[PDB]
Amino acid sequence: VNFNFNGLTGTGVLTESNKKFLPFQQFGRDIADTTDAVRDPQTLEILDITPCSFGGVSVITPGTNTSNQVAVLYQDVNCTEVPNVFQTRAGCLIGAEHVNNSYECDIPIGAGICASYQQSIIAYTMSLGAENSVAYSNNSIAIPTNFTISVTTEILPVSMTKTSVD
Amino acid sequence: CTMYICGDSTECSNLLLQYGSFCTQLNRALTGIAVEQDKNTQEVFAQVKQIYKTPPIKDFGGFNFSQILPDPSKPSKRSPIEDLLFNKVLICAQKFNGLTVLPPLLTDEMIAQYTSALLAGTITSGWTFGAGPALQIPFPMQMAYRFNGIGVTQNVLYENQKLIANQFNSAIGKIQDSLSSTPSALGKLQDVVNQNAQALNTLVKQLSSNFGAISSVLNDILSRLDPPEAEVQIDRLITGRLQSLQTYVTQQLIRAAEIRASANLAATKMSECVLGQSKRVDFCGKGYHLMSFPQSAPHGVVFLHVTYVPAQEKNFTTAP
Amino acid sequence: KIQDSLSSTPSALGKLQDVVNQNAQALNTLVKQLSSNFGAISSVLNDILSRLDPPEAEVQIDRLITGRLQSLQTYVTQQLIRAAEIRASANLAATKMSECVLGQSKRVDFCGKGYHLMSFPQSAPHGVVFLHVTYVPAQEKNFTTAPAICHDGKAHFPREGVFVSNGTHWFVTQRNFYEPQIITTDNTFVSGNCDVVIGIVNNTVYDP
Numbered sequence: 001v002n003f004n005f006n007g008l009t010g011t012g013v014l015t016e017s018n019k020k021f022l023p024f025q026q027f028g029r030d031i032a033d034t035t036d037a038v039r040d041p042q043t044l045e046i047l048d049i050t051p052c053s054f055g056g057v058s059v060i061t062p063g064t065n066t067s068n069q070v071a072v073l074y075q076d077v078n079c080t081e082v083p084n085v086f087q088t089r090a091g092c093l094i095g096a097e098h099v100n101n102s103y104e105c106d107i108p109i110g111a112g113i114c115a116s117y118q119q120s121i122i123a124y125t126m127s128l129g130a131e132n133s134v135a136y137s138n139n140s141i142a143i144p145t146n147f148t149i150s151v152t153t154e155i156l157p158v159s160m161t162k163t164s165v166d
Numbered sequence: 167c168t169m170y171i172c173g174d175s176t177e178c179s180n181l182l183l184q185y186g187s188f189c190t191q192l193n194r195a196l197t198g199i200a201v202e203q204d205k206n207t208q209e210v211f212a213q214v215k216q217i218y219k220t221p222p223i224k225d226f227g228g229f230n231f232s233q234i235l236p237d238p239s240k241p242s243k244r245s246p247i248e249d250l251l252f253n254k255v256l257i258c259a260q261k262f263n264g265l266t267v268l269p270p271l272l273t274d275e276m277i278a279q280y281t282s283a284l285l286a287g288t289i290t291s292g293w294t295f296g297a298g299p300a301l302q303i304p305f306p307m308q309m310a311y312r313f314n315g316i317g318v319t320q321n322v323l324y325e326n327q328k329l330i331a332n333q334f335n336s337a338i339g340k341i342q343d344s345l346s347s348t349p350s351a352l353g354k355l356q357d358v359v360n361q362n363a364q365a366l367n368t369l370v371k372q373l374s375s376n377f378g379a380i381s382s383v384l385n386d387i388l389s390r391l392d393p394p395e396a397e398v399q400i401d402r403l404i405t406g407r408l409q410s411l412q413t414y415v416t417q418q419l420i421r422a423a424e425i426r427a428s429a430n431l432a433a434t435k436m437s438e439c440v441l442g443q444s445k446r447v448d449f450c451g452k453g454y455h456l457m458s459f460p461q462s463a464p465h466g467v468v469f470l471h472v473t474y475v476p477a478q479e480k481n482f483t484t485a486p
Numbered sequence: 487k488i489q490d491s492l493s494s495t496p497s498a499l500g501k502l503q504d505v506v507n508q509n510a511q512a513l514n515t516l517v518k519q520l521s522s523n524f525g526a527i528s529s530v531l532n533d534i535l536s537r538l539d540p541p542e543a544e545v546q547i548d549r550l551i552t553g554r555l556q557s558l559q560t561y562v563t564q565q566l567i568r569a570a571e572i573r574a575s576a577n578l579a580a581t582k583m584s585e586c587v588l589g590q591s592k593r594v595d596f597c598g599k600g601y602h603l604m605s606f607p608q609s610a611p612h613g614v615v616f617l618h619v620t621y622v623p624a625q626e627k628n629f630t631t632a633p634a635i636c637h638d639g640k641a642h643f644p645r646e647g648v649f650v651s652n653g654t655h656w657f658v659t660q661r662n663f664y665e666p667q668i669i670t671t672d673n674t675f676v677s678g679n680c681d682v683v684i685g686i687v688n689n690t691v692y693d694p
């Protein structure tokens with residue numbers, strides 16, 4: 001709601017407060033020194049005031065070279081207040097199908113969840129790599145037979161265009 | 167920023183639009199910072215492509231790694247020291263002005279899995295897991311390679327293997343006790359947490375400043391004044407809040423740059439101290455490098471560096 | 487394989503392309519800020535001077551000066567921080583040039599993934615590309631090992647390698663490449679006896 005409590009105005013959701021206001025206190029403020037509590041002017045009831053649920057919208061997508069299908073992430077907003085709905089740590093992720101199978105991270109979601117296009121968009125808990133139990137014992141050594149030579153390419157920035165703004 | 171500077175106000179947002187993209191290059195810079203932090207994390211921890219595991223029978227030389235290797239009974243498969251480190255070391259009010267906090271991509275359980283894989287690899291394979299397929303090698307023989315690396319013959323190790331294992335065990339116990347006792351030991355991470363808490367608390371507290379306006383409350387300004395006067399008072403508030411936000415972002419970019427340098431040092435130490443054996447003096451601890459162990463910590467990494475240090479003195483005469 | 491990988495994968499040079507894109511965006515944003523009013527009645531300086539007399543023109547121009555100067559200061563600050571990161575990258579590239587190209591490094595994963603043999607510099611737009619040649623172990627084979635050999639009651643230790651468990655035939659081989667050799671007094675040394683070392687296999691030694 002949009003409220004006006006004896007001149008105090010703002011937008012938010014009104015809930016019952018558990019604050020122990022003293023008989024003379026009419027409203028409260030947070031550490032930020034903004035209003036966060038009000039005593040109702042007609043019934044001497046104490047209300048807590050918080051703003052209405054909000055959050056960023058991120059679009060999870062493969063490139064337009066491949067598909068025009070997208071998924072939308074409402075960051076840190078519960079699935080219920082949002083209006084293939086998948087709840088995760090970052091929030092409610094709608095349009096991506098959740099599958100247990102883990103894969104390499106393609107599009108990161110956050111908190112261990114990554115997304116990829118596999119065709120459709122899927123969401124999953126990321127794999128950290130293949131498992132490899134080492135055959136350890138107190139008396140066993142492995143030694144390479146045929147060996148290989150590998151060439152790795154490393155690319156580093158060195159300079160940037162030298163602009164001059166009079 | 168559209169919430170930090172003109173929160174829940176369409177008229178204010180329309181006035182802010184007269185300043186173009188200052189609001190979008192600051193948010194772009196902060197998005198870049200978040201991406202940069204995730205990049206720093208995987209450069210530090212995602213240096214092994216396989217998650218290595220130790221055998222069920224932890225017979226690793228009489229050297230007790232139970233302290234740094236994960237304990238299954240505790241939920242989070244952290245080491246005892248790692249659990250100790252994590253135990254040792256407004257968001258609504260902030261969010262309400264549009265300054266939210268994004269979760270890290272890698273949770274503590276995956277960071278624990280990376281540190282577990284790196285430590286298990288070091289223990290069961292020496293440095294071979296970091297340069298190709300992991301070879302298995304007995305831990306005592308691995309110790310023999312590290313002794314040869316520091317210029318000490320293998321026989322010193324084999325003749326004194328029991329004392330070396332006992333001295334190692336007490337050094338590990340000493341690390342556990344030192345971290346458990348001294349609260350200031352993790353000051354390097356606590357100062358970063360405090361600097362970010364202060365930066366956010368200062369930025370948020372700047373919203374209580376008038377900046378020359380008759381009132382700091384945007385709803386009160388719009389509730390009291392009509393457009394011909396409200397535009398000047400709001401413009402004054404826009405100037406003050408935008409300057410404070412620009413200062414905040416600049417402070418985050420410089421602090422992030424220092425964190426980036428620290429991340430490069432941590433990644434270099436991970437590769438050179440953990441995935442190998444370094445001959446660089448005082449790079450990986452004070453002494454002659456034998457091996458190092460990574461440990462997970464809140465927003466950071468802790469290295470346990472095992473070094474060889476000469477003790478008792480005895481004089482001899484020499485000749486060329 | 488390097489030629490084909492670079493020819494095929496467009497994103498391979500993302501590290502240089504992101505820098506080019508960041509500078510293009512910084513300049514495009516700075517230039518686009520000139521179309522902003524910053525509170526003035528018009529973004530065009532010629533239009534302000536053509537419609538208003540000097541006493542008022544001074545207030546509207548001062549408003550434009552404040553907005554354009556703040557945008558330029560923001561640009562320069564962004565270039566100083568980006569330049570500082572580029573400076574750090576340049577120090578890393580110069581260190582890699584000296585240590586990877588003008589020598590042979592023993593620092594693991596500094597100059598590519600593997601055991602460093604050599605590196606090659608290559609020119610690139612506003613940057614450098616390094617081709618790192620590394621040695622990587624491939625095929626696996628299991629052997630049983632032992633810490634020492636007890637010959638005449640003395641403990642023999644290898645100077646350079648690790649003992650291989652043929653089955654019938656303990657041999658010593660260089661650590662990173664299987665090359666078994668006959669156990670002799672020329673590839674082992676003697677220190678102490680077999681009574682203290684944990685695991686000695688008492689195999690036979692030869693005195694060529």
Ligand SMILES: *[C@@H]1O[C@H](CO)[C@@H](O[C@@H]2O[C@H](CO)[C@@H](O)[C@H](O)[C@H]2NC(C)=O)[C@H](O)[C@H]1NC(C)=O
Pocket residue numbers: 145146147
């Ligand atoms: C080691 O591996 C290489 C392959 O990587 C083998 O080389 C091949 O040898 C055959 C003849 O035996 C040739 O026909 C192939 O063209 C070779 N391939 C390449 C790419 O070199 C080599 O034989 C192996 N050697 C050992 C010691 O097993």
Ligand SMILES: *[C@@H]1O[C@H](CO)[C@@H](O)[C@H](O)[C@H]1NC(C)=O
Pocket residue numbers: 042043044
């Ligand atoms: C008017 O306000 C008083 C408190 O001042 C309250 O007790 C009373 O019930 C209210 N009456 C009406 C008409 O709501």
Ligand SMILES: *[C@@H]1O[C@H](CO)[C@@H](O)[C@H](O)[C@H]1NC(C)=O
Pocket residue numbers: 078079080
């Ligand atoms: C979202 O709302 C539902 C229904 O009230 C609740 O069961 C669930 O726990 C909520 N989740 C979060 C993240 O608060």
Ligand SMILES: *[C@@H]1O[C@H](CO)[C@@H](O)[C@H](O)[C@H]1NC(C)=O
Pocket residue numbers: 098099100101
């Ligand atoms: C994933 O695992 C959970 C828990 O066992 C199960 O309820 C769910 O049906 C599984 N989903 C898939 C894709 O198999």
Ligand SMILES: *[C@@H]1O[C@H](CO)[C@@H](O)[C@H](O)[C@H]1NC(C)=O
Pocket residue numbers: 228229230232
């Ligand atoms: C290692 O330390 C723990 C400490 O609780 C102890 O219980 C255990 O017996 C020690 N020995 C080994 C090799 O596990």
Ligand SMILES: *[C@@H]1O[C@H](CO)[C@@H](O)[C@H](O)[C@H]1NC(C)=O
Pocket residue numbers: 636638639680687688
């Ligand atoms: C090893 O050699 C010593 C001395 O000859 C001998 O006493 C001992 O029994 C031997 N152990 C074996 C056969 O492994």
Ligand SMILES: *[C@@H]1O[C@H](CO)[C@@H](O)[C@H](O)[C@H]1NC(C)=O
Pocket residue numbers: 652653654655
């Ligand atoms: C062991 O040595 C024998 C002696 O000829 C040789 O024939 C054999 O290939 C070697 N390897 C094994 C597994 O015995």
